[PDB]
Amino acid sequence: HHWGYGKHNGPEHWHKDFPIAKGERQSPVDIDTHTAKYDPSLKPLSVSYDQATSLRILNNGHSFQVTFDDSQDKAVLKGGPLDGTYRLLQFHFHWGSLDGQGSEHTVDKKKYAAELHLVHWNTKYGDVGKAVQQPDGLAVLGIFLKVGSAKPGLQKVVDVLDSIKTEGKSADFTNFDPRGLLPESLDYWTYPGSLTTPPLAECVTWIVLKEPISVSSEQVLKFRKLNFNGEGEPEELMVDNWRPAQPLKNRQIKASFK
Numbered sequence: 001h002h003w004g005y006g007k008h009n010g011p012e013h014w015h016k017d018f019p020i021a022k023g024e025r026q027s028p029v030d031i032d033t034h035t036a037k038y039d040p041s042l043k044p045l046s047v048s049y050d051q052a053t054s055l056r057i058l059n060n061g062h063s064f065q066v067t068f069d070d071s072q073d074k075a076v077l078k079g080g081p082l083d084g085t086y087r088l089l090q091f092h093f094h095w096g097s098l099d100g101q102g103s104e105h106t107v108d109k110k111k112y113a114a115e116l117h118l119v120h121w122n123t124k125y126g127d128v129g130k131a132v133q134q135p136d137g138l139a140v141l142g143i144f145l146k147v148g149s150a151k152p153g154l155q156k157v158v159d160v161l162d163s164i165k166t167e168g169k170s171a172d173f174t175n176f177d178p179r180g181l182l183p184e185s186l187d188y189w190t191y192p193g194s195l196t197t198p199p200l201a202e203c204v205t206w207i208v209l210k211e212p213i214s215v216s217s218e219q220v221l222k223f224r225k226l227n228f229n230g231e232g233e234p235e236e237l238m239v240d241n242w243r244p245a246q247p248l249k250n251r252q253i254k255a256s257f258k
Protein backbone atom coordinates (compact mmCIF):
# COMPACT_ATOMS: atom_id res chain seq x y z
CA HIS A 1 0.00 0.00 0.00
CA HIS A 2 1.39 3.07 -1.62
CA TRP A 3 -0.60 5.84 -0.05
CA GLY A 4 -3.67 7.53 -1.39
CA TYR A 5 -7.07 8.85 -0.39
CA GLY A 6 -9.21 5.68 -0.36
CA LYS A 7 -10.61 3.51 2.41
CA HIS A 8 -7.56 1.24 2.59
CA ASN A 9 -4.74 3.69 1.96
CA GLY A 10 -6.09 7.11 2.90
CA PRO A 11 -5.11 9.70 5.51
CA GLU A 12 -5.96 7.55 8.54
CA HIS A 13 -3.47 4.92 7.28
CA TRP A 14 -0.59 7.30 6.58
CA HIS A 15 0.95 7.12 10.04
CA LYS A 16 2.04 3.51 9.48
CA ASP A 17 4.57 4.50 6.74
CA PHE A 18 5.02 8.14 8.03
CA PRO A 19 4.79 8.21 11.86
CA ILE A 20 5.13 12.01 11.91
CA ALA A 21 1.50 11.99 10.74
CA LYS A 22 0.68 12.03 14.45
CA GLY A 23 3.20 14.79 15.19
CA GLU A 24 3.01 18.12 16.95
CA ARG A 25 2.75 20.42 13.85
CA GLN A 26 0.65 18.64 11.26
CA SER A 27 -1.37 20.29 8.47
CA PRO A 28 -3.99 21.14 7.50
CA VAL A 29 -5.91 22.61 10.43
CA ASP A 30 -9.21 24.31 11.12
CA ILE A 31 -8.75 28.07 11.29
CA ASP A 32 -10.99 29.28 14.08
CA THR A 33 -11.33 32.93 12.99
CA HIS A 34 -12.36 34.16 16.43
CA THR A 35 -9.33 32.62 18.19
CA ALA A 36 -6.71 33.63 15.59
CA LYS A 37 -4.87 36.67 16.92
CA TYR A 38 -4.24 39.78 14.91
CA ASP A 39 -0.50 40.35 14.96
CA PRO A 40 0.25 43.97 14.01
CA SER A 41 3.96 43.05 13.71
CA LEU A 42 3.32 40.73 10.70
CA LYS A 43 4.48 42.36 7.44
CA PRO A 44 2.55 42.42 4.21
CA LEU A 45 3.34 39.40 2.12
CA SER A 46 5.60 40.09 -0.90
CA VAL A 47 4.61 37.98 -3.96
CA SER A 48 7.04 38.59 -6.87
CA TYR A 49 5.90 36.43 -9.78
CA ASP A 50 6.52 38.79 -12.75
CA GLN A 51 9.50 36.71 -13.96
CA ALA A 52 7.97 33.26 -13.28
CA THR A 53 8.94 30.53 -15.79
CA SER A 54 6.45 27.63 -15.83
CA LEU A 55 7.80 24.42 -17.37
CA ARG A 56 5.47 21.41 -17.25
CA ILE A 57 2.09 20.22 -16.05
CA LEU A 58 2.05 16.72 -14.52
CA ASN A 59 -0.43 14.18 -13.09
CA ASN A 60 1.47 12.69 -10.12
CA GLY A 61 -1.21 10.21 -8.95
CA HIS A 62 -2.36 12.46 -6.07
CA SER A 63 -2.99 15.86 -7.76
CA PHE A 64 -1.86 17.73 -10.87
CA GLN A 65 0.99 20.19 -10.60
CA VAL A 66 2.45 23.06 -12.61
CA THR A 67 6.23 23.11 -12.16
CA PHE A 68 8.47 26.18 -12.41
CA ASP A 69 12.17 26.88 -12.97
CA ASP A 70 13.49 27.31 -9.41
CA SER A 71 17.17 27.55 -10.50
CA GLN A 72 17.08 31.35 -9.91
CA ASP A 73 15.09 33.95 -7.92
CA LYS A 74 12.40 34.49 -10.65
CA ALA A 75 9.21 33.83 -8.74
CA VAL A 76 9.68 34.47 -5.03
CA LEU A 77 7.78 34.87 -1.80
CA LYS A 78 9.21 37.11 0.94
CA GLY A 79 7.98 39.22 3.87
CA GLY A 80 4.86 38.33 5.79
CA PRO A 81 5.93 35.94 8.55
CA LEU A 82 9.03 34.84 6.56
CA ASP A 83 12.73 35.55 6.96
CA GLY A 84 14.57 35.41 3.68
CA THR A 85 13.58 34.44 0.17
CA TYR A 86 11.52 31.47 -0.97
CA ARG A 87 11.49 30.26 -4.58
CA LEU A 88 8.32 28.95 -6.28
CA LEU A 89 8.73 25.29 -7.22
CA GLN A 90 5.19 24.25 -8.15
CA PHE A 91 1.51 24.71 -7.59
CA HIS A 92 -1.21 22.11 -7.35
CA PHE A 93 -4.76 21.71 -6.04
CA HIS A 94 -6.92 19.61 -3.72
CA TRP A 95 -10.60 19.18 -4.56
CA GLY A 96 -13.76 17.28 -3.81
CA SER A 97 -16.27 14.98 -5.45
CA LEU A 98 -18.90 17.74 -4.84
CA ASP A 99 -18.60 21.44 -4.08
CA GLY A 100 -19.14 21.09 -0.33
CA GLN A 101 -15.72 19.53 0.27
CA GLY A 102 -12.24 19.62 -1.21
CA SER A 103 -10.27 22.15 0.82
CA GLU A 104 -7.69 20.95 3.30
CA HIS A 105 -7.76 23.98 5.61
CA THR A 106 -11.18 24.85 6.86
CA VAL A 107 -12.45 28.21 8.21
CA ASP A 108 -14.75 27.91 11.27
CA LYS A 109 -15.26 24.33 10.00
CA LYS A 110 -16.37 25.54 6.57
CA LYS A 111 -14.95 23.46 3.70
CA TYR A 112 -14.30 25.05 0.31
CA ALA A 113 -14.66 23.25 -3.04
CA ALA A 114 -10.91 23.26 -3.57
CA GLU A 115 -7.62 24.63 -2.34
CA LEU A 116 -4.64 25.87 -4.32
CA HIS A 117 -1.16 25.45 -2.90
CA LEU A 118 1.79 27.42 -4.23
CA VAL A 119 4.86 25.67 -2.86
CA HIS A 120 8.09 27.64 -2.24
CA TRP A 121 11.40 26.69 -0.60
CA ASN A 122 13.92 28.75 1.37
CA THR A 123 16.95 29.59 -0.78
CA LYS A 124 19.26 29.44 2.22
CA TYR A 125 18.98 25.64 2.02
CA GLY A 126 19.83 25.51 -1.69
CA ASP A 127 17.41 22.82 -2.85
CA VAL A 128 13.95 21.58 -1.91
CA GLY A 129 15.14 18.17 -0.61
CA LYS A 130 17.34 19.92 1.93
CA ALA A 131 14.64 22.47 2.76
CA VAL A 132 12.05 19.81 3.70
CA GLN A 133 14.45 18.69 6.44
CA GLN A 134 14.26 22.15 8.17
CA PRO A 135 11.52 23.66 10.29
CA ASP A 136 11.58 26.85 8.14
CA GLY A 137 12.35 25.18 4.86
CA LEU A 138 9.13 25.71 2.91
CA ALA A 139 6.43 28.36 2.63
CA VAL A 140 3.13 27.25 1.14
CA LEU A 141 0.65 29.87 0.00
CA GLY A 142 -2.89 28.45 0.33
CA ILE A 143 -5.84 29.87 -1.59
CA PHE A 144 -9.45 28.67 -1.26
CA LEU A 145 -11.69 28.11 -4.30
CA LYS A 146 -15.45 28.59 -4.19
CA VAL A 147 -17.78 27.85 -7.12
CA GLY A 148 -19.46 30.76 -8.87
CA SER A 149 -17.98 32.94 -11.59
CA ALA A 150 -15.14 31.60 -13.71
CA LYS A 151 -11.52 32.45 -13.00
CA PRO A 152 -10.08 33.48 -16.38
CA GLY A 153 -6.50 32.93 -15.28
CA LEU A 154 -7.28 29.28 -14.50
CA GLN A 155 -8.63 28.42 -17.94
CA LYS A 156 -5.28 27.68 -19.58
CA VAL A 157 -4.72 25.01 -16.91
CA VAL A 158 -8.23 23.48 -17.20
CA ASP A 159 -7.87 23.20 -20.95
CA VAL A 160 -4.87 20.92 -20.95
CA LEU A 161 -6.08 18.50 -18.22
CA ASP A 162 -7.50 16.14 -20.90
CA SER A 163 -3.85 15.54 -21.97
CA ILE A 164 -2.66 14.38 -18.45
CA LYS A 165 -5.62 12.22 -17.45
CA THR A 166 -3.68 9.42 -15.74
CA GLU A 167 -0.82 9.10 -13.32
CA GLY A 168 2.58 9.77 -14.93
CA LYS A 169 1.39 11.89 -17.87
CA SER A 170 2.88 15.33 -18.35
CA ALA A 171 2.82 18.10 -20.95
CA ASP A 172 4.67 21.27 -21.89
CA PHE A 173 3.22 24.14 -19.88
CA THR A 174 5.22 27.24 -20.66
CA ASN A 175 4.30 30.93 -20.27
CA PHE A 176 1.73 30.36 -17.55
CA ASP A 177 1.34 33.36 -15.26
CA PRO A 178 0.39 32.38 -11.69
CA ARG A 179 -0.59 35.97 -10.87
CA GLY A 180 -3.86 35.13 -12.58
CA LEU A 181 -4.79 32.76 -9.73
CA LEU A 182 -4.48 35.33 -6.92
CA PRO A 183 -7.40 37.06 -5.12
CA GLU A 184 -7.43 40.85 -4.62
CA SER A 185 -6.40 40.85 -0.95
CA LEU A 186 -3.26 39.33 0.50
CA ASP A 187 -4.70 39.29 4.01
CA TYR A 188 -3.68 35.99 5.56
CA TRP A 189 -3.54 33.63 8.47
CA THR A 190 -0.21 31.94 9.31
CA TYR A 191 0.88 29.02 11.49
CA PRO A 192 3.76 26.47 11.60
CA GLY A 193 2.86 23.13 9.99
CA SER A 194 3.67 20.38 7.59
CA LEU A 195 3.36 18.95 4.08
CA THR A 196 -0.20 17.67 3.77
CA THR A 197 0.98 14.67 1.69
CA PRO A 198 3.61 12.04 2.52
CA PRO A 199 6.26 12.43 3.78
CA LEU A 200 4.25 14.91 5.97
CA ALA A 201 7.49 16.67 6.89
CA GLU A 202 7.18 19.39 9.52
CA CYS A 203 8.90 22.03 7.41
CA VAL A 204 6.23 24.47 6.35
CA THR A 205 5.28 28.03 7.23
CA TRP A 206 1.66 28.10 6.12
CA ILE A 207 0.26 31.35 4.69
CA VAL A 208 -3.49 30.94 4.04
CA LEU A 209 -5.25 33.81 2.26
CA LYS A 210 -8.58 34.93 3.73
CA GLU A 211 -10.14 35.82 0.41
CA PRO A 212 -11.15 32.89 -1.81
CA ILE A 213 -11.07 32.95 -5.60
CA SER A 214 -14.21 32.01 -7.52
CA VAL A 215 -14.02 29.34 -10.22
CA SER A 216 -16.84 28.04 -12.38
CA SER A 217 -18.62 24.73 -12.13
CA GLU A 218 -17.22 23.85 -15.56
CA GLN A 219 -13.65 24.52 -14.40
CA VAL A 220 -13.94 22.31 -11.29
CA LEU A 221 -15.75 19.59 -13.29
CA LYS A 222 -12.59 19.28 -15.41
CA PHE A 223 -10.50 18.67 -12.24
CA ARG A 224 -12.88 15.82 -11.43
CA LYS A 225 -12.23 14.04 -14.77
CA LEU A 226 -8.63 13.32 -13.82
CA ASN A 227 -7.71 9.81 -12.70
CA PHE A 228 -5.70 8.61 -9.73
CA ASN A 229 -4.84 5.49 -11.71
CA GLY A 230 -2.33 4.91 -14.47
CA GLU A 231 -3.45 4.32 -18.04
CA GLY A 232 -4.81 0.76 -18.45
CA GLU A 233 -5.77 0.30 -14.75
CA PRO A 234 -9.37 0.41 -13.51
CA GLU A 235 -10.61 4.06 -13.78
CA GLU A 236 -10.84 5.78 -10.36
CA LEU A 237 -11.70 9.47 -10.49
CA MET A 238 -9.12 11.83 -8.89
CA VAL A 239 -11.60 13.38 -6.42
CA ASP A 240 -11.44 14.01 -2.68
CA ASN A 241 -7.64 14.24 -2.70
CA TRP A 242 -7.64 16.28 0.52
CA ARG A 243 -6.28 15.49 3.99
CA PRO A 244 -8.74 16.40 6.78
CA ALA A 245 -7.98 18.93 9.53
CA GLN A 246 -5.41 17.74 12.10
CA PRO A 247 -5.06 18.64 15.76
CA LEU A 248 -3.78 22.16 16.40
CA LYS A 249 -2.04 21.15 19.64
CA ASN A 250 0.29 23.81 20.99
CA ARG A 251 0.10 26.20 18.04
CA GLN A 252 -1.16 29.74 17.55
CA ILE A 253 -2.71 30.88 14.28
CA LYS A 254 -1.92 34.55 13.67
CA ALA A 255 -3.86 36.91 11.38
CA SER A 256 -2.29 39.71 9.30
CA PHE A 257 -5.52 41.74 9.49
CA LYS A 258 -8.05 43.11 12.02
Ligand SMILES: [N]S(=O)(=O)[C][C][C][C][C][C]C123[B@]45[B@@]67[B@@]89[C@]1%10B81%11B698B746B814B562B%10%1143
Pocket residue numbers: 117119128129132140194195196197198199
Ligand atom coordinates in the same frame (compact mmCIF):
# COMPACT_ATOMS: atom_id res chain seq x y z
N1 LIG B 1 0.14 19.65 -0.11
S1 LIG B 1 1.47 20.44 0.18
O1 LIG B 1 1.51 21.77 -0.49
O2 LIG B 1 1.62 20.53 1.61
C1 LIG B 1 2.71 19.57 -0.60
C2 LIG B 1 4.08 20.15 -0.85
C3 LIG B 1 5.07 19.10 -1.31
C4 LIG B 1 6.32 19.67 -1.87
C5 LIG B 1 7.30 18.67 -2.40
C6 LIG B 1 8.30 18.15 -1.39
C7 LIG B 1 9.15 16.96 -1.75
B1 LIG B 1 8.41 15.44 -1.72
B2 LIG B 1 9.68 14.36 -1.11
B3 LIG B 1 11.15 15.36 -0.80
C8 LIG B 1 10.79 16.93 -1.30
B4 LIG B 1 11.73 16.04 -2.36
B5 LIG B 1 11.04 14.39 -2.29
B6 LIG B 1 9.35 14.47 -2.88
B7 LIG B 1 10.58 15.54 -3.62
B8 LIG B 1 8.98 16.19 -3.25
B9 LIG B 1 10.46 17.19 -2.95
Ligand SMILES: [Zn+2]
Pocket residue numbers: 092093094117196
Ligand atom coordinates in the same frame (compact mmCIF):
# COMPACT_ATOMS: atom_id res chain seq x y z
ZN1 LIG C 1 -1.21 20.65 -1.32
